Structures are given as C-alpha cells and as structure tokens.
C-alpha cells in the first residue's frame, strides 16, 4: 500500500528512536569541517614550535576520520539486524529481493544526507570559535576572521559519500545472504580463566612499578618490559569479561542462601550472561579511554614542567658566550633606560669518582662513575653558602635525577687530577641552580668547593676535557619591568641565534604541548560521544529481551515504582564497571612515568577524570528514560 | 505553588543560564572584548530576571488554584476569569461537562414527573369505577349483604383516599388554604362516612365539642381526622369512641379517645413510623401502617401537633393541638 | 470473612451494555473449603475476578475481614492486596532464572524477615508439600506436576486470609491432581485458611465442603455436604449437573 | 497552533531579545569593546534561542490540543496522560466531575428501582380487593342487579389485567415459557371469564376446532384470546361468534369471527396503533384502545402474525398465525 | 489433500551427517484438524520446512492437491505457495507502523484487486473473528491475544486450501490460547481448510481429532478421538505420551 507512504512512516518512526545517531553524525561533520577549514587558514603560521603547525592538523583530521568511519559502520550493522522479521515477511508476501532493498535504502539516504547537509551549515558558524580557542592556549594575539574556505566542502562531501557507498555495499551483502525464508551450570574451565585473567592484570600492574627504578637499564631491555606490560594488561582485560565476572557472580549468588530481593533478581541476570557476550567491545572501550586520559594528563603536566624547567635551564635571565656580543648588548641596554645587574663566574670542568655514593645497582652507568663530567666553582662567587676545607655541596634538583640516581649521605669522592687526588665528603644536596645546562652536559649536578681548595684546583686546570668557554657570562635585569623590549633587543643582538634567553625557551614548549592538548582533547571528546552512543544502542535489545520478565513480575503485586527503582541499579552496574577498570588502568599508567615530563600530579588527573565521568554519566542517564517506556507497556 | 512553579518552568531558567554562560565564555576567549563589562551586565540581568520571575509567578499561578478550589466545594463560581488562551480550553471543557450534566438531569426529572402524572391519572381511572359500583350498589334490600359490601367498599375508598393523599403530600405546601373550619359539621361528616364499620362492629360515638371553630386547611385536616377515626374504629370492637375538643391555653386541642385494645407501650414510639405494623396479631398484616405517617407529615405545614396517649388493653387517646390564630399571619404574609 | 451485598457488573464498550452480574450475595465463614462451578458462558470467572481486587465493581459493596475494599484508591488497594489475598493461577508463572527456593521466597522480600526465620518458614512450608528435596533444581528440570506445588507453596508462605484459586487442576493427570488436592486439603485442615476455587471438574469439587452453582448470574440452589462420604457427594454433584 | 504558543509565552521572548538589544546598543557606543566581534555572540545566541523555541513548542502544545479533541465528539479516554502539574490538576478535576455525574446516574437508577417497588406494592394492594369482591359477589340471588354488578366487576378485572400485562411486557422476555397448550380448555376458561358480558349481550360461541394443539406461551396467548373475545363481544350485539382452529400447512392458526359492526376500512390499518380509538361511536370513549396493541406486541416475540379482515356492517376477522415447531429450537437452544 | 511418500531430508555438512527424516507416510483429507505431535530431537522444524517446501526437497514424492512439488521451478514454487498456502507462526509478525486493517489487507494489496471485494473479505473475516470493532487501531495498543488473532486473520483472507501453523501457544496464557483455538475450530467447519498444528502442549492438541506421535520418524501410533468429550481424549493423549 502506497510504498511512498510506507517509506515516509518508517522514516518518521526511525527519527524518534535513533536521535543520538543523528546528533553524533552532525557533531562529527561539524568537527571535520572545522579542522579542514582551520588547516588551510593563512593565519595558522603564527604558531612557532618544533611542529610546523599546519602538519599536525593534517594528522588530526586523518586520525578523526577513522574514529568516525568505524562508528558509522558498526551502528549501521547493529541497525539492519533488527529488520529481519520484516524482511522475511516481505519475502513470503511475494516481494522480490530487489524491491526490499529499495524500500529500506530510500528511508535512510534521506536521513543521512539531511544530517550531512545540516552539519556543514553548523560547521561554518563555529569555524572562528575554534581559531579563537587555539589562539589562547598557545599564546598568540593575532586576529581571526570568519570565512567559508570552499576547500573544506569538497573534502567533507567526498569522505562521507565514500562512507555511504561502503554502507550500501554492506547492506546489500547482508540482504542476499541471511535471506532464506526462515523467520545453566558452571564448569572448571571458567574458574581457571577468571583466575588467570585477574592474575595477569595484577602482574601487569606490578611490573610497571619497577621500570625506571633500578633495573632493566638498557636502551633495548626497556622495550621488552613495555611490550610485556601492554600485552599482559590487554589479555588480562579481555579475559576479565569472558570468565572473571561469572566467577564473582557465582560467589555472590551462592553466598546469599535463597533470600533474593527484586534488585538482585534484576541485576544478577544481565551481568552473568550478557557481559560475557560482549568482550571485544568493552575491552576496546576501556583501553582507549585509559589511553586518552593518560595522554591528556601528561600533556597538561608538561605546562608547569615548561615554566619551571625553562627557568632552570638558563640560570640568569640571559646567557652569553661571546664577549663582543655581550658588550654590544649591554651598551644597547645602557641607553635604553634599563639598568642591568651583571655578574660572571668561571667554571672548571673535571672528572671525579662518585661510584660509592649511589645506593642502587651498578647497572645505572650513564657513563663511567669514576669518569663522570662534573663542574667545579669557587666559594666566594656563591653568596649563600660558605663551605670549609675538605667539604663539598651539590647543586640542582632535577626530579628525574633523584629518582634515577640515588645519592647517599657523606661518602668519599676522589679528585681525578693529573697527578694528585684530594678526598672529600658529601655534605648535602641543594635545591637551586647556578650554571646553565650547556656546561653541565645533560643534567649532571655541580659541586661547591672551598676558596682555599679552589685556589689550587683552578691553578691546576687540566686541559683535557675542557670546553670552549670556561665562564658563565650572563646578564640579569632590574626589578619587574617591561621585559618584552629587552627580549627584542636581545633577538636583534644575535643574528646567528647562538645565545639563549629565559622567555624564549619557555614558549616553544608551551606551543608544542598546547597543540598536543588541543588535538588530544578534541579526539577524546569524539571518542566519548561515539562510545556512549554505541553502548546506548545495546540496552534497547537487552530491554525488549527482558520484557517477558517484567510481565510475570507485575502479576505478583510489584508496581512500576518498584521495577524502575530496580532498573536504576542494573543501569548503574552495566555502565560503571568499564569506567572503573579504565580509571585503574589510567592511574597505574600515569604514576609509573610521571617523572619524565613535569613535577606535579594529582592536580590535573582528578579534573580530567571528573569531566570524563560527568559526560559518561549523562550518556548513562539517558537509558532509564527508555526502560520506563518499555516497562509501561508491559501490563 | 512555588515548588510546582519552579518544577514546571525548569526548562527556561536553564536556557537563560546557558545563554549567560555562553556570553561569558565567548567574551573570555577574545582579546577585543573586555571581561568586566560583560560580568557587570550579567549580574544586572540576573537580578532583573529574579524580579521578572517574581512578577510572572504572581500573575500566572492563580487560575489553577481557582479550578482546584472549584473541584471540591459548594461554589461553581470558584474559577476565576481566564485571561491567557491556555485557560480558555479548560474553561470550555468544564462548561461543556456542566451543560451536559444539567441537560441530562433536567430531562430525566421531566420524564419521571410525566410518569408520576400518568400514574396518578391511572389512580383516578381506577377510583372512578369504585364510585360507579357504589352508585349501582346503593339499592340493596338485604341488611347483612349490604353491610358487608358497604364495609368492603368503604375500606377500598379509604385506601384510595390514603393513596391520593400520599401523592399530594409532596405538594401540600402548594395546596394549603387557611380558613376557619366549623368542627361540628366536619366531625358529623366523618362519623357518617364510617357508619358501616361502626354498624358491623357495634361501635358508638359521643360528641362533646367545647370548641366549634378551628383555623386550618379543610381537606388535609379532614383527611387527618378521617385517618384517626378509621384507625380507632379498626382497632376497637364494640366500644364507644369519645371525640372531645377543648381550648387549652391559646391553642385549640382536639382529643380522639377509643376503648379498644390500645397500643403496646414498647410500640408507642413507633406508631408514627413509616410502614409500621402491629406484630401481636396477624389481622394487622393487611394494614398498610401509612395513614398515621401521612397525617403526621401533613400536620406539620398546618402547625398542628399530634399527641398520642395509649394504654395496653384500656384505650388510645389521640390529641390534635390546633395552632394559635396569630401563628398563621406569618404564613399568610409569605 | 467474605461478605458481598448485591454486587452488579455490566460489561460494555460504551455503546452496548450487557450486564453479567445481577445481584449476587454470598456468605463465607472463616476456614471453609468452598467451590464455584456451573455453566460455561456464565459470570463465575468474572465473579471470582470481582470478589478479589483484580477487577473493579459497578454497583455493590464487598467486605473482607471487616475492612471495606470498594472505597479505596489504587495505591491503598494494591498495598492491601499485596499484604493478603494469596493467588494460585491457572498457569505456572515461574521465573526461569531462579531456583525453587528463590521463586517461592522472592515475594517475602518486602517484609524484612532477616534470614534465619525466613529459612525456617521455607522449611516448614516445603516439608508439607514434599518439595524440600528440590531446593536447588531449576524449574526447567522438574515435572509439570511439581511446578504447581511450587506455586502453591509460594502462595501459602505469607499466611494470607483468603486464597483465590482459579482452576488449578486444569492441566494435570489424575494422579498429580489427586495428590495436589490432598495436600491442599491437609494444608487447609492444619492451619485455618479460606480457599475459594473455581473448577469444571466434579472430582476436583468433590473434596470441598460447600458448592455454589452460578447460573446466568443467579444462585440456583446451594449444596452443603457436611458429614457425608466423598463418593456420595460426588454422585450428588453429578445428579445436580445432570439437572442443569 | 503557532499563534497561541507565541501569544501565551509572549513575555519570555521579550526578556531575551531585550538583553541582546541592550548588549548591541552598549557595544555600539563604548570605545573599548569592538562592534565586529559582538554580532558573532548575538548570532550564536539567536540560533540557540530559535532551536530551543522549536523544540519546546511541540512538547507543550499537546495536552491542550488533546483536550479539544476530547471536548465534544467521543472517546472519553482521548485525554492524554498528564505530565506537568497543571495538566494533572486539570485532569483530576475533570475526572472528579465525571465521577460525580456517574454517582448522580446511580442515584437516578436507585430512585427508579424504589418507584418500581412502590408500584408493585400498589399492584398487589389493588389486586387483593378484586378477589375479595369476586368472592363476595358470588352469593347473589337477584338476576338483573347481579348481572350489572358482574358486568362492572369483569370490566374492572379486565382493565386491571390489561394494565398488569402492559407493565409486564417490559420484562416478558425473561418470563417466556412455551409449551404445548390445549386450545379448548383455554377457550372455555376465557369464555367463563366473559360469562357475564356474553350473557348480558346474548352472545354465544361456536367451537369447532380442527386443530387442538398450539405451541406458544400459555399465559400471554390466553390474555390475547381473552382480549380478542372481549372486543368481539363488545362490538357485537345479539350475534354469534365463530371460533375455528385449522392446520394451515405447517403452521397452526385460530380464527375469531363476529357479526358485529366491524371497522371502517379507513381505520382498519390503524387498529393496532397504540391508543387508536374509532370516533364513529360515542361508546368508544370508554375503550382504551390498548388491549389490541398489547396483544400484537406480545405476539411479536412468540412468532404469531395477526391478519385483520374487517368490513363495516359485516364483522371483523382476527387470525393468530402460530409458528412452526422447529422455529422454537433456535430460541430454546440459544 | 497431500500425500507423503518416503519423505526424507538430506544433509552432509563437512563430514558428519544426520538422517533426521527417515521416510514419512501421511494421509489426510479435506476438513481435518490434524496435529503432528512428538518429542524434541525429531526435527519438527525440519518437518515444517520439508512439508512447506521452503527448503529444496531431497527425496520423496508429495502431491499438493494433485501437483508434485518437484514439478515446478523456484519462481513457480513461490507463486504456488503464495497462491495456495497460508502460514501462522509462533511469534506474531505484525509491522508496528501499520494499522489493524492495513496489516490484514497487505497480502491482498499486491494482487491488483478492486476495493469492494477486499472490503467485503475484511468485514466478514473480522466479524467472524471478533476484531472488527478494533478496525483502525495500531498493534502497539492491543492485548496479546488480539495480535495473534490478527496474525491468523492475515492468512485467511486470500482463500487458501491448507493452513500451516507452527505452535500458536508459545507466548499466550490459558484464556487467550483457549479463545484462539476455539476460533480456529469454528473457522475450520465453515470453510473447508486443513489445519496442521505442530505443538508440544497436550492442552493445545486436545482440540484436534487426529494426533500423530513421532519419535525418530515413521511411528504412527495415532489416536482418532471420534466421539470423546475433550477430557478422556486429553487423558489418553497424556497417557500415550507418558508411555513413550
Ligand atoms: C576526554 C577529555 C574531555 C575533555 C573535553 C574538554 C573540551 C574539549 C577541549 C579542547 C581544549 C582543552 C583544553 C584543556 C585545558 C586547557 C587549559 C588552558 O589552556 O589554560 C588556560 C585556559 O585556556 C582555555 O580554557 C581554552 C578554552 C578551552 C576550554 C574547554 C573547551 C570547551 C569546548 C566546548 C566549546 C567548543 C565548541 C565546540 C565543541 C562544542 C589558557 O592559559 P592562560 O589562562 O591564558 O594563562 C597563560 C599562562 N601564561
Ligand atoms: C560542535 C558544535 C556542533 C553543534 C552541535 C549541534 C547538534 C545538536 C542539534 C540538533 C539535534 C538533532 C537531533 C535530535 C532531532 C531528532 C529528534 C526528534 O526530532 O524527535 C522528536 C522528539 O525528540 C525526542 O524524542 C527527544 C527530544 C530531545 C532533543 C534531542 C537532544 C539532543 C541530543 C541530546 C544528547 C546529549 C548528549 C550530549 C553529550 C555531550 C519527535 O518525537 P515524537 O515522539 O514524535 O514527539 C512529537 C511531539 N508531539
Ligand atoms: C558550543 C556552541 C553552541 C552553539 C549553540 C548551540 C546550537 C544548538 C544546540 C542545541 C539547542 C538545544 C537542543 C535540545 C533542546 C532540548 C529541548 C528540551 O529540553 O525539551
Ligand atoms: C553541558 C550540558 C549537559 C546536559 C545536556 C542535556 C541536553 C538535553 C537533555 C535532554 C534530551 C532528551 C530528553 C527527551 C527524551 C525523550 O523524550 O525520550
């Protein structure tokens, strides 16, 4: 009857059930259009860092299209398997196989292309807000202008047309194959599988706690440990759902006797049998959630890392190594109404033996312990400490170094001079820096010696491992003032860019990690929405599968105000377990290696976890509103 | 209604707050828009929104209170006058339901009144052949057969009169006619009416009327006297019934006393009950027990009090206290 | 306990009205085993429905244990009908994901009876119906003659006032039917529980003490039995059916 | 219903639009906030507002349309399930008023039942006197006066029986009792009932019944036969009435023929009308014209067909067409 | 109508093969209500597939009303089943976006027939089934039994000759199942159309007149009712199934 009317009614019915699908499609099209418009913007080159700036957006776009193209293809194969009782009926009524295809592939192209056409119109309104968000994290005061950038339209249209062709191919393959006309007790294996899964997860957690502690110290021995940790955790997570929930469910069940209330009857019938059926999807969700949270948290810590480490890398506000350039810069500062405080200090490069002061293992070489390059400075130059003869004090913190190189209390240090050796003892480790990073190799600390000892050590001055400049010419600045014009003066001093400045090595790091945060945050948002929609589309089937149970339960006196109160806990257990496993994974991943980027945790991690939990909880709250409708019509 | 008002309008305050947050965010993320001015304007608009919400609540939460006080009370005018379109529909629904109720009730009452009128017409059509039978039969020669037939005819006529007065007791108030009534001719007529029963039962009558005139309605008072005399004759055998009327105080009192079986003291309070019958004898089963109830109910609009004094095995005394002359002036005024 | 005063029910779709209850009045004292039977298009099923709270009333009043049910709102009616009025259905109505010890103990979970006395009560009930050996067997593993004794045991634990049985022995063979009826009679005798049964089987009604022959929504005589043999009452009921 | 929604919630849109206008106007003048970067804010807010209005229209303007659909036509259940508190109050008030209407209907039914009970009470209280009068009358010695009294008594009894059958024909369907009836004893009983009128008018009956068995309701068939015989006797003077029953094919029939005045052909088709009276004779005023209607109406469920062949000055023929035996098997079995 | 002669179904996936059908001989006549009962593991679903000729037959000769099922092609087979056969399934298959009238008239709307005859057929069928009052409602707002009755009414509109039927009692309680079986029995007598139920419930098969018990193949061991009273026949069915 009136095939047009049938198609229209089916379209209006589909628009009511799958509205989250339409929302996800519109949001994905909006983000893709926004990124492609932003990539070709000529104002994107104001971002300067190691990453070019217009070659990271090109990577983000390609990474996003895969996340969208997997969700679309999985949703469109969940959908079609709920239209089989209609396909068989249409085949036995008398219709062919090339008319059902046209009936059910003309009620879907309308929805798809309407959502696509709406998404492009709402992807032009927010194209400038993305620019303005980017030009606030990586500090830039350029101007953003609203435009269309036609180049993005072609790309979006081509991409989504290709995805639609894939969907049509998959539907046509399904129709011709599954067409025809045809409309417990626990075992010993499950116990072993559950125990194995839990043991594997615990072992994977334990091994990661060592890594950069004392052992595995070889540039290739680490990779084996990392591969073992990842493989063990993934396999344990996969086996946690097949067998390790049935075991605990059996314990909880045969730990009650026979007294079960309505909530437990509704609960211990889904997650004993249906959580097992979904093992390859929940595993993916948990691992990718953990990855996103960990990466975002580390990228956030890298900010305060940048600030403090860039303050530490150059001791003074500026660093110089050529006397002519330094004198020219100070003359230029003189007439600029800027009074500079200048103080220089010579440094001695020598090797000493400190093998006896590490309390760890000999495997921590990083060079010969008896030939380590250290820096020696006088005691009159330092205005804070006044050591005595036969005494030495260390300098620098380098939170990485303490965790990797453990320093004992007072020991013995042998001065490896040409023909003499004066032993000293370790007094203590200081907290401030005194010399730039270039002289002290990577991050090796520096020692403090007495003026009397210096008076002879500088006289010795073995010229075998000395560098070009044994001095720390570096100009400070006056009290808090306008440092920007001083930076401009310094920039025009060095056309060869051979000197370093305090507030230019503290900007490349900010730009790089701000770009990283931007990309990871947007990809995490997209994956969050995708996983929420996919997990919401299964509770529909799980609900019309449990409809008979509600019917029988309502002839024994139970009312809707009790069935819904029991469903509100099943819908908590079905949505909370992957979240908790992902949170544990993230916590035990971040803590293992947080001392490689920054120097502070528990600040960003909590906030990222709370935001993720809030959005996931919205997507979880939206399903009781469907369970209520199912229960209402089962009298 | 504050909680109800803020649970019905929970979808507009959220929109307002989201709009404010969007404005603040877009102002924050730009360098060309000062933040402080936007903060000040957000604050001022929040306060003005509070005041606006107060006014709109006070204006809007009235008609529903009016309809909720309409549903369970005794005033149809509890609903206030609707002002916004979303109230006129509810008003129309209520008006339509009330109109349907009134129309159905009026039609049903009219139909039942017509049925009652047809029923009393049939009562008249039944009572007429009784008069025809009386006219045909008032030519007898045998004394005993004539006495028996007249007794039965008088019983049937009394039953028909009782039924007619039962029908008319619902509108006696529309039948009241206040005028002075000569007691002696009325009592003589009542005695002549019940002559056959006294002849068969050997019942005598003595008339002692100190008071000759009373103020009441002729027809209903005559019916009450006839009912009392019929009950006295039926409940008495071969005894003299004493009818006395005397003026006590400012009211006229009529006393009807017989020397019959009397009334049981346990049954004295229940003689005026509707449908009451004596349980001692099976001869009283055929008695309707409704004449006394009709007489007592019809006596109230006549301002006549019925007093009864009975002794078991000795006799029954019925007293009728006529009203004061000035007590009917208020009735005539209305 | 039960007392109805001139009940009346009219089944109509707002266009055609056909009354099926025409002034039924019944009188049941505490602790008797009565039955209702007669005809096939009569209102006996609707009579059983209206006596309980599963269906409403048009004209009449019904009293249970002194309390009145006609003038009650759905919340109070549901609460009262949960707290009393055990039900035995025609079909099993058993959940297939629980055991026998949990199906007949789930309804008793909204009264907070701890665990030990609940287990003791379950043992008491299951030792009389002979199902104590099936505490851990799922319903899809026992014969059809025991999945009805399970329902009866479920309906007997909370000690209700009146137990409404609607053709229990409808889909069983003679042996299981006789065994179930004997167990029901013993349960009635031990603890005083009123049982109202609707049946088409004269053998099923033989075990009762009183019988009511609803005919076109009327009374049409009423037997009383008393100190009489089961067989003789059976031929008496057979003769009464032959008359009707 | 766009206009109703816009007018009803007309004071909420003004607040948002006022805020936008104020922000634009202030940003116009102040030389610290750019004007090119605030139209963007206004634009985003406008889209959000429009989408919110469109999504809020359809969730609100539903119940007030369902009420209008419910208003007059049909489908008492058409009202949707309320969601907001105001909808709940409206629905509860409407349901309460409908329940009050149902209670009023129940009170009307109770009043009707009480009236029927009182009518039956009067019916028996009237039927006892006729039996008493018959018992007393069956002792007379005189001829002419006894004949007149019997005439009047039979007239009263026949009228009362007609009224009783008219009252009972509302529930006759629950009183039907069909069995084999012997025509001759029933006709003899009806003639003995009409003995007085037949003797006074000198009318005999010629009984020649070829068919002696009928299948119908004995009581109502006897009533119909008595009414037909009474009408034939009344409309005839000093004439013989012929009664013949014959087997016409598979159907039984009974004939009543009189040699009276007959009925005018212009009035013959209307004889069975309710209350139809012939104005040719002044004597027809006493005739109620309702016995024939009752006879025909009672013949309808019994499958009895009445054919009339009346000629003025010759007589009237009344024929009862009894049905076939097997036609009662669809009535007894179902 | 049809005849069964050595009805066998072939198999042979990978290496393991089963002989589910081992030769079937069935003789039935017009105006019958034959039921094919049995036990699990006998391939009753495969029996329906072979009997309905949905799957390609392997061996045996079957003549549906004088026409062999091996004498026509795939399109010819489809036309034959759509023009001569009707189906009723266990789970009702009714579109939720149609009405109770369009659902019934859908099979007859793909045949190019005038509106008057379709309206007459719908009126007579819905009047004889009792769903005519619900002529324009949706299957989302009707009870459980009315949906199955509509599904049964779909297959009775195009004047078939054999009405195949899977278990029409799977998702119905006692009252709905009894009403549906009574309606089917009434419809069988009016117009000649054979009904072949395949159920595992003695209550649903007690309304029949010819029961066949299949354990692994050709077994017969059949009852024939004749003049029973629907109760003795029920007990006989239960007894003869319990023996096996
Ligand atoms: C899976 C995780 C889900 C998280 C989803 C959050 C939204 C998606 C985000 C993209 C940007 C995420 C940025 C993370 C936090 C950035 C912190 C930050 O930038 O700090 C400061 C604040 O900067 C910002 O907040 C930039 C604005 C991003 C806020 C969150 C974005 C909300 C996105 C919703 C609106 C976007 C429209 C499109 C999506 C609906 C900047 O530094 P400063 O205060 O100027 O001081 C300079 C120091 N000398
Ligand atoms: C980066 C920024 C990009 C901009 C993002 C824009 C995307 C949001 C836009 C448009 C929403 C389109 C999706 C919903 C439209 C389809 C739903 C629909 O119209 O169905 C209508 C009713 O809709 C509904 O049932 C639910 C209404 C809720 C509105 C949709 C909610 C939007 C999505 C909420 C999801 C929240 C997740 C957010 C997570 C970050 C018709 O149904 P009916 O039963 O026939 O009632 C008729 C009334 N008498
Ligand atoms: C992040 C920039 C946002 C730009 C404006 C937002 C665009 C429109 C967004 C959604 C509008 C509201 C959609 C859902 C309304 C729900 C209505 C309801 O609660 O019944
Ligand atoms: C940061 C925003 C968080 C909250 C976002 C909520 C968006 C709207 C929520 C309601 C949408 C669905 C409500 C209707 C559902 C239904 O009718 O079935």
Author numbering:
A (entry chain A): 1 to 183, 195 to 646
B (entry chain D), D (entry chain E): 1 to 334
C (entry chain B), E (entry chain C): 3 to 246
The authors write:
Residual signal subtraction focused on the TM region was followed with a round of 3D classification without alignment, generating two distinct classes of particles with high-resolution features in the TM region. Refinement of these two classes independently produced separate 3D volumes each at ~3.4 Å overall resolution. We refer to these two reconstructions as TM-state-1 and TM-state-2. For simplicity we focus on TM state-1 for the following analysis. Within the detergent belt 14 total TM helices were clearly identified, with 10 belonging to BceB and another 4 belonging to the BceS dimer. The cryo-EM maps were of sufficient quality to build atomic models of TM1 and TM2 of each BceS monomer de novo. Several types of interactions mediate dimerization of two BceS monomers. In the middle of the bilayer plane is a cluster of aromatic residues including Trp12, Phe16, Phe49, and Phe52 that form an extensive π-stacking interaction network. The total buried surface area between BceB and the two BceS monomers is only ~460 Å2 near the apex of BceB-TM3, which contacts TM1 from one BceS monomer and TM2 from the second BceS monomer. Nevertheless, our cryo-EM structures clearly demonstrate that most of the interaction between BceB and BceS is mediated through protein-lipid interactions rather than direct protein–protein interaction.
